[PDB]
């Protein structure tokens, strides 16, 4: 069920969706975040064809309210430059194609220093 990611303080992390796409389909990808201690972080869209242009459809202000950088979002991938407790929790990726697909993957990001 969960893709578990163990992270260290002030290390970066990357969540990589096991992404597979069909040429010429329009896709929208969303990332949602359920903090440990719901919120759509971001939504992007593009026609699938590095050289892939995309449009940023929506973005959340959650991390900005905390004076922290929101994750960077690219097709298939979520990046956090510096780990801190407010980035820990559950991330859900959902990508929807104009061919009718909806794909989900869920990540659990936890702090390495808390064993068991």
């Amino acid at each position, epitope marked *: 069920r969960l893709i578990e990611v163990s992270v260290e303080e002030n290390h*970066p992390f990357t969540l990589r969706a096991p992404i597979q796409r069909i040429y010429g389909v329009r896709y929208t990808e969303t990332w949602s975040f359920l903090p440990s201690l719901e919120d759509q972080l971001a939504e992007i869209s593009y026609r699938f064809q590095a050289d892939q242009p995309w449009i940023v459809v929506n973005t959340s202000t959650l991390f900005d309210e905390l004076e922290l950088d929101p994750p960077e979002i690219e097709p298939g991938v979520l990046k956090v*430059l510096r780990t801190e407790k407010q980035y820990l929790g559950v991330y859900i990726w959902n990508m929807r194609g104009s061919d009718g697909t909806s794909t989900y993957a869920t990540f659990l990001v936890t702090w390495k220093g808390d064993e068991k």
Partner: antibody
Amino acid sequence: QVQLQESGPGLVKPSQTLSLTCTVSGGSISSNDYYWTWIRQSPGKGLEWIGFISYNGDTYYNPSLKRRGTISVDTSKIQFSLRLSSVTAADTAVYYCARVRTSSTTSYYFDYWGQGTLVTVSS
Amino acid sequence: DIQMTQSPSSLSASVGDRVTITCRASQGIRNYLNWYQQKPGKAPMLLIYGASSLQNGVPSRFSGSGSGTEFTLTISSLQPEDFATYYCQQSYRTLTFGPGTKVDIKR
């Protein structure tokens, strides 16, 4: 100790892609103890972080470069490189490669630096 | 982005003086603050990390303090070789540098 050497063109035409290579000696690129970064310096805009790469190849970028920068690593030759696309005169600068350390109580810092390479964007 | 500011822009001091340079972060950055020394025609060189940890091989006359938004670099017994531009840099959000403080030597 670890040493870094940049190499690349001095002159690049506007709209072309700046390409630079940093070669690492006295160490290797194989541990999440270190990240490998590009930084630049221009009289006007001071020092600017461009981005860095981990040993596994994960990249993280300054959003200010508008995803025009690509950092890649070739751990075999203990090298890493920078590609900056669609260059303008505003990209004229001294480009430096450096090693990055981090810790739970300090976060990132740049502990060893290459000597810098001046890249002039001009028609 | 976090705006790092420094004071003074430049100073002139005599050999043997004690000089302090100030660095301010636009928001709290804990102690994620580094100091770099840049001599003419050289790359910046790390002096202090974590606001107060002296890098190995850096002379003990360099000292850093601060946490939060205000940081200080003190050079306790200024030397001719300390002619340089000194820069602060934050590692709490997208990495940013201050604009540098130029230290000139009076003789």
